[PDB]
Scaffold this motif. Structure first.
Motif, PDB file in Angstrom:
ATOM      1  N   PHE A 266      -4.705   4.279   3.213  1.00 52.94           N
ATOM      2  CA  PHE A 266      -4.360   3.649   1.947  1.00 52.94           C
ATOM      3  C   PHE A 266      -5.416   3.968   0.895  1.00 52.94           C
ATOM      4  N   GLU A 267      -4.999   3.983  -0.369  1.00 51.19           N
ATOM      5  CA  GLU A 267      -5.926   4.051  -1.493  1.00 51.19           C
ATOM      6  C   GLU A 267      -5.742   2.803  -2.342  1.00 51.19           C
ATOM      7  N   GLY A 268      -6.837   2.071  -2.551  1.00 48.00           N
ATOM      8  CA  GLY A 268      -6.768   0.826  -3.294  1.00 48.00           C
ATOM      9  C   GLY A 268      -6.237   0.985  -4.703  1.00 48.00           C
ATOM     10  N   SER A 269      -6.545   2.107  -5.352  1.00 42.68           N
ATOM     11  CA  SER A 269      -5.988   2.391  -6.668  1.00 42.68           C
ATOM     12  C   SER A 269      -4.472   2.525  -6.662  1.00 42.68           C
ATOM     13  N   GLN A 270      -3.837   2.563  -5.492  1.00 40.53           N
ATOM     14  CA  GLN A 270      -2.386   2.599  -5.397  1.00 40.53           C
ATOM     15  C   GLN A 270      -1.786   1.368  -4.733  1.00 40.53           C
ATOM     16  N   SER A 271      -2.597   0.402  -4.316  1.00 43.66           N
ATOM     17  CA  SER A 271      -2.061  -0.836  -3.770  1.00 43.66           C
ATOM     18  C   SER A 271      -1.231  -1.572  -4.816  1.00 43.66           C
TER      19      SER A 271
ATOM     20  N   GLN B 245       0.851  -1.177   0.000  1.00 44.15           N
ATOM     21  CA  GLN B 245       0.000   0.000   0.000  1.00 44.15           C
ATOM     22  C   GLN B 245       0.890   1.231   0.000  1.00 44.15           C
ATOM     23  N   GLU B 246       0.292   2.380  -0.291  1.00 43.25           N
ATOM     24  CA  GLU B 246       0.930   3.669  -0.075  1.00 43.25           C
ATOM     25  C   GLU B 246       0.279   4.314   1.137  1.00 43.25           C
ATOM     26  N   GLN B 247       1.090   4.696   2.114  1.00 39.48           N
ATOM     27  CA  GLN B 247       0.570   5.404   3.271  1.00 39.48           C
ATOM     28  C   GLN B 247       0.282   6.858   2.935  1.00 39.48           C
ATOM     29  N   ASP B 248      -0.830   7.356   3.459  1.00 35.47           N
ATOM     30  CA  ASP B 248      -1.076   8.783   3.545  1.00 35.47           C
ATOM     31  C   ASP B 248      -1.208   9.255   4.982  1.00 35.47           C
ATOM     32  N   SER B 249      -1.211   8.339   5.946  1.00 37.67           N
ATOM     33  CA  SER B 249      -0.997   8.656   7.346  1.00 37.67           C
ATOM     34  C   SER B 249      -0.047   7.615   7.920  1.00 37.67           C
TER      35      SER B 249
HETATM   36 CA   LIG Z   1      -2.486   7.982  -1.593  1.00 38.74          CA
END
Ligand SMILES: [Ca+2]
Ligand SMILES: [Ca+2]
Ligand SMILES: [Ca+2]
Ligand SMILES: [Ca+2]
Ligand SMILES: [Ca+2]
Ligand SMILES: [Ca+2]
Ligand SMILES: [Ca+2]
Ligand SMILES: [Ca+2]
Ligand SMILES: [Ca+2]
Ligand SMILES: [Ca+2]
Lengths: 206, 206, 206, 206, 206
Positions: free
Chosen positions: C146-151, C137-141
């Protein structure tokens, strides 16, 4: 007979009269066969040409191996035809083997040691023994009625014939030039008759 | 039993009746499996074909390995489907292995020794053992309802099945032809029944 | 510790909850680092994905390795970003190493043993030790958003981290898998928590 | 002197101020020379850059090795210019050697060990010894008037110079890194001064 | 006589005066010949050029090897021409051998060790011995009437001539550079005159 080893027939001009006639010591109908040869020509992108024509008095295309323009190798027995698609081709000496078996009609085609998919043709047919075998031309009558637009230009050689389907291992040894003994038509021990402008020269392919 | 080593089933004509039925000595339901096979065909650019069809009385596509035109290998279990897309295909004998595991739904697909990305399918399912395995055709009823436009043409062989996920090392030895012992379906020790025009011939792929 | 040698984390399904959190025994703030990993995914043509996200409470992208669609590897430190463009890519397991050093801001990027041109980023910065490392995932906190479109979907493994710039010779040894001893994050001696739908399987890449 | 073996100058930013000045212990005017170097940059598709700039107070481009966008290498002596066109370029460290000889004006250009066709330039000229050699920038005055759009970005190294035309055998040994001893400019025995931010790092190419 | 081994003639500029004249100890008219040479030029995409011009007072193109723009090698004897088409060319030193034989008119053409298809030219002709052989230009009169748009630019060397058709084995030896003895024109023992600016330099090709 002549040992044509390392030699090839050169057909350097387009004509309706440069051909060689090959004699088979064959007296029984072929239930199956394999034919293997090298040929080299640039015609492949311009027009079709007969690579190898086997005819009998009742059947002008009893076996024919034919390049068809922008399509590839036509293979036909008993006048019925299948295509082995060759969507692009490079100018190099090409070895082929091809084999057919009445019991199944399985055709194998082999180009430069690689098998084409087995296809069905003329199951249960028989190929006549009384054969006029001609190289350099496509004959529409027994030993005659050539068409210049279907002649081969370039070289043909190592023309060998077996009255049985060579196994893929045998075909591999042919392509590598291992030891083999044809029994219908043998380039090491060929009986042939040359007509018109045709030359025998050292083979260009290894 | 028959040792089909060095042999392949040849399906030389499109038909709705050329098939072979393979018998598995299987009674436990499969929580997981691996199936590996060689096939060779030219259909891949023209139309889809069934490569390997496993059915059970509740489920006509209990496992199906399928080529869908211009898409690639359809793989489906319990009728649910995923694609391992193949944007360029070349006419050569292709080896595949494919493996599935209920505990995770992880599908491994392996073409010519190269892994495809693992994908999820039917986590927690089970594949029935009361099974009809058919090659050459796609069956829409337990042993029938074939569609000719989905038959295989060409060759299939080395059809091996394990009731477990082969590790990548194992699959590597399969692709290289190392020693292995399938326990659901074994090409060296096959039980099969042939129907229609289908032939056993020496395998073209090495 | 877990010895993840020969293992890989499989993320077979797109989700906003499949991730693994990796723990670093790190207390010194990093003046420099090298991170090397194997990942394998087909997403590269469809959408972007996070390969490796290192975050600190004041900085969600303290180090991020990110595939950006049709552009290539985004690499960013302290939110500042550079691109190592990849104009065409093929579906294969890809090894990367990447290195950064506050003293110069020299970023090295290496793909499958080949160096990318050294680029400048965040000269004089420092990377916090109070870090949450997440794969998939990509962390934003600091541990979420997470955003699934970036997993990531597919596999990631051999995730190793050093608090110094590996020399090219060292990186060559990593790519060939010679003996090496990471000291921030060691795949042979990993501490991690798995969350959601994630599996550990044998690595597909050799 | 510094032995820069296995090291390269890294120019990680575009600028009009980051350059390296190289000193030659040279007093005889050059009737011939060979320059060999590795450089690595991605600029080749975006814009031109100076690879190697030799100036004298009469003449700012007394020798220039230059990349001109989408054209290829520009080699100029005494202001006059020839092109060694490169229609296909790939992002990899590129080795060049370049030789010139007053007696004939024969220019040799060599890229990655392959000769370009010999061309004529400035027959009968002579290259001055009172020279300022700069890496990373192109100069329009004896040590200045750089243009950022012509700076190099990336790496340059193994910058060697001979006051004679190396034979093709010699140049082959250079490309393979065999034993050689430059006498105008020796990377193994370099005298230089660095201005702006330019970093010495281990060479990325082998 | 000069042993030109490892040397080549360099024609670095387009001109109508750079040529070299080669002398043969030849008095018997040639029923056949082989000529082999290396040449290197970039002109192949820009314009045609002479590779090898053999003239007799009766016939300005008694043998000519020529590059025809976007066509390939023109080969002609006795003023009559054939094309060995080359649809794509790459800038590298190219070796050719070519052979002709009055008895058959069989022309062999060989490029970088690969045979072109044998073609028929000027059967029954004879090439005169009282010959002016010129490199770098095409003759339109015995020893003269050059045209600059047809000059060679770049390099030519290893120019060897035999008064007989070399076998394919011989030609393979030549291409590999095994031992051979030319008997019409021998690069190891060449007799020539240089006119205008032409330089002898070490050969760029191996
Ligand atoms: Ca993100
Ligand atoms: Ca006919
Ligand atoms: Ca006809
Ligand atoms: Ca079905
Ligand atoms: Ca169906
Ligand atoms: Ca973010
Ligand atoms: Ca300038
Ligand atoms: Ca300037
Ligand atoms: Ca003329
Ligand atoms: Ca002319």
């Amino acid at each position: 007979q002549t040992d044509m080893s390392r030699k090839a027939f050169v057909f350097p001009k387009e004509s309706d009269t440069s051909y060689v006639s090959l004699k088979a010591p064959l007296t029984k109908p072929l239930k199956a066969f394999t034919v293997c040869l090298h040929f080299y020509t640039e015609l492949s992108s311009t027009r079709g040409y007969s690579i190898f024509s086997y005819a009998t008095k009742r059947q002008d295309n009893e076996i024919l191996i034919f390049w068809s323009k922008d399509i590839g190798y036509s293979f036909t027995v008993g006048g019925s035809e299948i295509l082995f698609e060759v969507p692009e081709v490079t100018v190099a000496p090409v070895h082929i083997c091809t084999s057919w078996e009445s019991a199944s009609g399985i055709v194998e085609f082999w180009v430069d040691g690689k098998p084409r998919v087995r296809k069905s043709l003329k199951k249960g047919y028989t190929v006549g023994a009384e054969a006029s075998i001609i190289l350099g031309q496509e004959q529409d009558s027994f030993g005659g009625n050539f068409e210049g637009s279907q002649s081969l230009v370039g070289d043909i050689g190592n023309v060998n014939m077996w009255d049985f389907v060579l196994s893929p291992d045998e075909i591999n040894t042919i392509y590598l030039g291992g030891p083999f003994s044809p029994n219908v038509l043998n380039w090491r021990a060929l009986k042939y008759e040359v007509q018109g402008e045709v030359f025998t020269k050292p083979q260009l392919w290894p």
